[PDB]
Amino acid sequence: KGRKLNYSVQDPIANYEAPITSGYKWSDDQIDEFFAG
Amino acid sequence: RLQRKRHQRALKVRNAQAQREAAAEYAQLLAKRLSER
Amino acid sequence: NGSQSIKAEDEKVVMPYVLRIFFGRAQVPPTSGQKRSRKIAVISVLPNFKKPYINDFLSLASERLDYNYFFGNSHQINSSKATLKTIRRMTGFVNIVNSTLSVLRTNFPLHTNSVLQPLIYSIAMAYYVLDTESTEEVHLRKMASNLRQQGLKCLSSVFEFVGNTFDWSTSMEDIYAVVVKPRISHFSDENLQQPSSLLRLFLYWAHNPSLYQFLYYDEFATATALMDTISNQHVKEAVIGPIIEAADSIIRNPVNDDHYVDLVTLICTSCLKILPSLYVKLSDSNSISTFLNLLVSITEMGFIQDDHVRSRLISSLISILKGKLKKLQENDTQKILKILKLIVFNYNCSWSDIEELYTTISSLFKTFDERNLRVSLTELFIELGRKVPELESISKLVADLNSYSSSRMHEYDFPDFINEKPNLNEASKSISMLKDILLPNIRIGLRDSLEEVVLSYMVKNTKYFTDFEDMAILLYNGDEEADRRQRAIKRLGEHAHQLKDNSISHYLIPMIEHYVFSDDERYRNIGNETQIAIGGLAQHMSWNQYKALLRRYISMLKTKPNQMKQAVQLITLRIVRDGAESKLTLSKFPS
Amino acid sequence: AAPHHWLLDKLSGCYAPRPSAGPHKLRESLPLIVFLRNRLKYALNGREVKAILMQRHVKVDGKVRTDTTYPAGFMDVITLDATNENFRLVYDVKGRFAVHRITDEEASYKLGKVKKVQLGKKGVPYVVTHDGRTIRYPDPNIKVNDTVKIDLASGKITDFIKFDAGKLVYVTGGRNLGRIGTIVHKERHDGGFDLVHIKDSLDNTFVTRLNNVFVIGEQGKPYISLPKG
Amino acid sequence: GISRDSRHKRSATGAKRAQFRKKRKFELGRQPANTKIGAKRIHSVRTRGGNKKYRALRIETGNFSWASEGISKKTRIAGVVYHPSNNELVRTNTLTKAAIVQIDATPFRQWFEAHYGQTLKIESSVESQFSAGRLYACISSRPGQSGRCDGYILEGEELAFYLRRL
Amino acid sequence: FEDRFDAREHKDRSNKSRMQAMEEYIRESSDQPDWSASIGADIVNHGRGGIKSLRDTEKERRVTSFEEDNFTRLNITNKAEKRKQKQRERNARMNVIGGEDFGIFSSKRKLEDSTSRRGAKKTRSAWDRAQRRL
Amino acid sequence: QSERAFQKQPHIRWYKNAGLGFKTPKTAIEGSYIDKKCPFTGLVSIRGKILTGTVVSTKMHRTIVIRRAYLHYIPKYNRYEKRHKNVPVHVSPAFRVQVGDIVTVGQCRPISKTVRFNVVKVS
RNA sequence: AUACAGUGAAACUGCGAAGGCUCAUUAAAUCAGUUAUCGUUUAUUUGAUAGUUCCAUGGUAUAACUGUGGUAAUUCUAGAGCUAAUACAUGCUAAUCUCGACCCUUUGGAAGAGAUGUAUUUAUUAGAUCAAUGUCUUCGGACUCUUUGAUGAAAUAACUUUUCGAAUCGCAUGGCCUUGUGCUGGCGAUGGUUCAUUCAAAUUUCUGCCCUAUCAACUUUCGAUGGUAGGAUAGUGGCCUACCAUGGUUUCAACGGGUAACGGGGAAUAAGGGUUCGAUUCCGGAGAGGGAGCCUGAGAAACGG
């Protein structure tokens, strides 16, 4: 289990991308009233 | 062209009658060494 | 294109038997000529037309080898094959001696015979064509002159065809029509027979059963002629016994003894050959030797002799009683041979054998004392059975001592032949003493004491189970005998057996000292026992390297003393092997 | 830039002649330019030794082999046609190439240490030597480090010298390189310092390897002639 | 592939401060060509002079050997069920050396019926495949180096030797 | 361990121990003559150089022997000449007075350490020195 | 004696001999042990040199860690500081080597990253 | 010299350049010797080394070259038309080898049976005996246990898109009468498959001068230590990956600390008096603007893509 699942932090991917604020065009209330069931 | 066809065939059969006879001619000397050993 | 056609042959089986027979029929329709050559023979043939025929035979060989079970065989292919074979024979035996196209058509004919034998190699018990006699008479009229042609170590065209024809059920109709076994037996009784003679003998031995199960009286007389060939080929399986395939001889001789009893001289020759089957080669196995002795007994149960084969069977039992191999199976067959040998010596032998071999009972020790009190005058097989019981067969120890003493009593009551019998007793006791036995070594020592009937006290004190004062008196007796080649070799062999790598006992230094003292007392006898001293030093030198070298080193050092006394006496010999053994000792020094 | 074996004077030049590839190795041979030009001095420079090589006077091992840097190693008999020059060159006692002069019946052959015997292909016994003469069919009792005698007209082995205790051996390699006398001792170890040991004037002792030694004859009778002083 | 050198890794003593060298030509690790089933395509790569190397990727015509008589005959490939040099290799169904792959054994049927006559002495758990058609057989040849798919059939001892495993 | 071919130990050195005082005493007690030149023939540049030293005329004799022996003139090879000819002639006009070099008397180098007081025949036993005398 | 897949067998029960003064035990000639890298049956061939010493640890299987102390004539501080060496070695079916046990090994064909030696003798 | 014939711009060709500067500081891991590779590559050097043939010579497609042109422009170009090969690629080819039923005795083999390769990758096996100078001589023999030697502990069933069985030349008209080049017929260089050697490279055994315990732990944190199999390899190899075991080095100096590591280690020549100046190979690895990927070759992660 040596090289298997190193839970470390890696240098070039720490800022490889950037997030997005709104993201999903739905609402989270639309998620809840989408899969209530 | 045809004189080359004479000479090619003659050198080929002479090469056979030299090599394939000399090979057995020292294989019989191996047979003499094996009989004397 | 040879590799391409080999690929086409390796993939030329995917279609059914109808399409395979259709492709074979198209191959047959190249140069068949069934309108011209299905009657007797061909009309005409050419070099390139025989090359189409040689290619047709090669394509038949390739097709049979590809489909080597069914082959899509047809009578059109058979007629084309017979036409090609007859045209090859006709062209080869009718063309003039120029040998180029003749050897081409001859290697066409041998390959066509090989392709013909391939058809019976592939589809033997499938077709069994009822119009066989057409091709049979064609090939017979072709190869009439092949009488002794197939007699070699590798001649297997017509010999393999004859073996195929003889190893069938109903395809022996062409065999029993006129002759197959006649020419086969001519080349079999040829005197320059190589090791295909055993193959032909096994083929006729297997083929006599089809000729016996055949209801035809012609095949019954042919089976009689096969038995007559087994009687007229009484030198082939004798002279060709160079391998361990003697089970074919033992399987024919049992078959012959179970089948045909035709002459008393034939039965005597069979018994003398099966006596040579145990007195010719020592590499005969248990089942083969048992069946050979049982076949000799089966010929003797029919037509034995009264003096000559009586003594031959008595010598057979005198060897088989010293053998007694394979957990008393050979002993039971030897008892049957002694009860079938039909003499007064054989009657006493069967009595004294059945009275001891009664399935692991006390009747052995009963019968030893019985024949001791009622000592028989045959005594040869009696000494054999009482020396096998004196050997390493655990029971009858005192009975073995009484048997040796009674043999000595008979050898003294003779007062010549029974002294030569005592020479055989001593030559048996020598190999008994040079062995790893325990009871039989003591029995051989008791036999040495009975032959000795100071020295007798020495022998009985060497066999005294005390070994300290006993070995001291043995050393003193060697000193008195110092102050005999085989005799001192036997005494030193018994001493070396009692001190033979038994390193769980003390005084091994004095034991090896007594061995070397007896060796020195034999080496003083230079006119007789110098050779025995050289042999004893040689056996001790072999033991100096054979896996144990502690006491054998002191044995070498103390057997050097004979050389020291001899060189002091000389003050001619063989320096060469002595110096080479000195070099071997110097090589053992660099160990 | 030179080795020690060539007997090469230092006041010669800057670039030393690398021998080309050939029978022997680089480290155990001298080329023809350092042979003819500056040892027995049949030339004065590379131009005229190439000139006499184009003229083809040299007949080393019975063949011409016109080349400047042809690596003549141990006992290749250099043969020169004019003034019937027959030269067998061996090792002296201090590491150089002593080139002895011999005669025609001695230059009609050479000898060679056998390196390995092989069942190579198609049932053919096989033998190699330091010039690599793959000659057919010797007897089965050719061990390693024995000595064949080459024919030098054809290639066949004519005589054979068995390697055993009590044979006259020549040592080419290590700190014993070029000694003769072959008897004080025999010692075959199991992987190193394994040999037959060689005497001296006071019969001193010496250690070498198996592959660094090879036999030349018997105790008093080598059929090679040897130089003296 | 990458490499063949001890310089990138630690020895039996535990050393550090490697930072060694630009890697040479003779540390050449080529890419692992996982040979599969497809249409027969062998890449002819070069190394060490004219040392052509056959890198097989989609080979089919396996020459698999009847064991008790040694009859190497031609057949197809189905799939490897067990090969724990990589337990995902059998999930992805590639074809490497020493793998146990399944074969439609119809030419072995043809050879048995051709050199024995009848159809079906041989073991029963391979007689079941004599009847059905798919027999287990293990690859001997190297398609990643020699480019070929040769193999040997499973007959009895080696059969149970793998069937008890998986 | 094992042997390794060493030309530096079977090479003729003979120069670590060649001292001019010992060599001069040997030339004195030699009892065979010395091959000296006709007297003017050994001065060099009309007297602009020295006479020439004994080592210089030995080296000159060696160079002319090699010269005639393989038919080649030696050269004006720049690095070796800028070392050896200029440094040699400057220490020649320093230390060679009238054909005799007096450089050695101005030089620390122990005689008995290297060139005398034998090392192989060291005789480190009373018995070995007794047998070396008798 | 089969704890792994992929037809554990000799590779052409099987038996050979390297020669050169090293015995082959009778179970290693005819026995059920596979001898994959034990040189008596093996796949490897022998060459090189042969080294001898006692052991330190035989903890893992197919790892024989020899020790080898040897004399060296030190001229620096004119006293002999004592040598020590280590070498891993594959097993043989002739001796379960425990602590002590001076044994010897022959050079052949690198098996792991650091082993070129395999046991040929125990005494 | 009416199919070639000397000069020869520009084009194909054979080869040439066949080993040159700067920058950051590696402690037997850079280096030197040595052991080995039946653990492996190899152009060139050298020695050796080929037997499957059914009813008078094989095909278009490109140059150079002409011709029409484009573009500011290149060792940038495109159409059209021809034309040659040691370029491409399909294909023409006598009978000899052993065992010898028979021998007519020497001029001895006629019949029959068995033959016939390489290159690639798969399995079974050939890879215990007999001869005397002697056991007993019964002056005959079963003889190996003794006394010594010997054969001896590639033959075959298949794949592969398989290479070949001379379209090279020179010297020598030479022998034969198959009635015309009817057979030519003798030798040598270049070929040509394969092996070994040599060359070189890669690994690998061991040996080799700083002070170092205020460096006492390191190694599993580029597998640590080994086993089994596969991949990749020129092959050996945890070199890489699956699974498994928890190993391995060390106070008999692990591992770690730096420079007069622009200095040192023989790395080597030594000099007829300079005693650590005084000959050289190498400081470590890189780099062709910067990292990355690919290609060529007997040899390369090319000073020239």
What about the largest sheet of chain D?
Answer: 3 strands, antiparallel
CATH class of the largest domain in chain D: Alpha Beta
Shape of chain B: rod-shaped
What is the β-strand count of chain D? Answer: 13
Return Rg of chain D in Å.
18 Å
The coarse silhouette of chain D is globular
User: Strand order across the biggest sheet of chain D?
Assistant: 1-2-3
Task: Estimate the helix proportion of chain D, in percent.
Answer: under 10%
Give an account of the 3D structure:
This is part of a larger assembly, with 7 protein chains of 7 kinds. Chain A is low in regular secondary structure and 37 residues long. Chain A has one helix at 28-32. The longest helix of chain A has 5 residues, at 28-32. The N and C termini of chain A lie far apart (41 Å). With 37 residues, chain B is mainly α. Chain B has 1 helix and no strands. Chain B has one helix at 2-36. Chain B is rod-shaped, with a radius of gyration of 16 Å. The termini of chain B are far apart. With 591 residues, chain C is mainly α. Chain C has 31 helices and no strands. Chain C has helices spanning 2-10, 17-27, 34-37, 47-66, 75-94, 100-123, 132-142, 158-166, 173-177, 181-188, 197-213, 217-232, 236-239, 247-259, 264-274, 286-303, 308-323, 329-340, 344-354, 363-373, 380-387, 397-413, 417-433, 439-452, 455-462, 469-482, 486-498, 508-523, 530-543, 551-570, 575-588. In chain C, helix 16 (286-303) runs parallel beside helix 18, helix 24 packs antiparallel against helix 25 (455-462) and helix 27 (486-498) runs antiparallel to helix 28. Chain C starts with a helix and ends with a helix. Chain D has 229 residues and is mainly beta. Chain D has helices at residues 32-36, 46-55, 104-107; strands spanning 78-80, 85-91, 97-101, 110-113, 126-127, 135-136, 147-150, 157-161, 168-171, 179-180, 185-187, 195-197, 213-217. In chain D, the strands form 5 sheets. Chain D has a 3-stranded antiparallel sheet, with no helix packed on it. A 3-stranded antiparallel sheet of chain D has the order 4-7-8, with no helix packed on it. Chains in contact: B-D, C-E, D-F, D-G, E-G. Chain E binds one RNA strand of 305 nucleotides through strand 2, strand 3, strand 4 and strand 7.
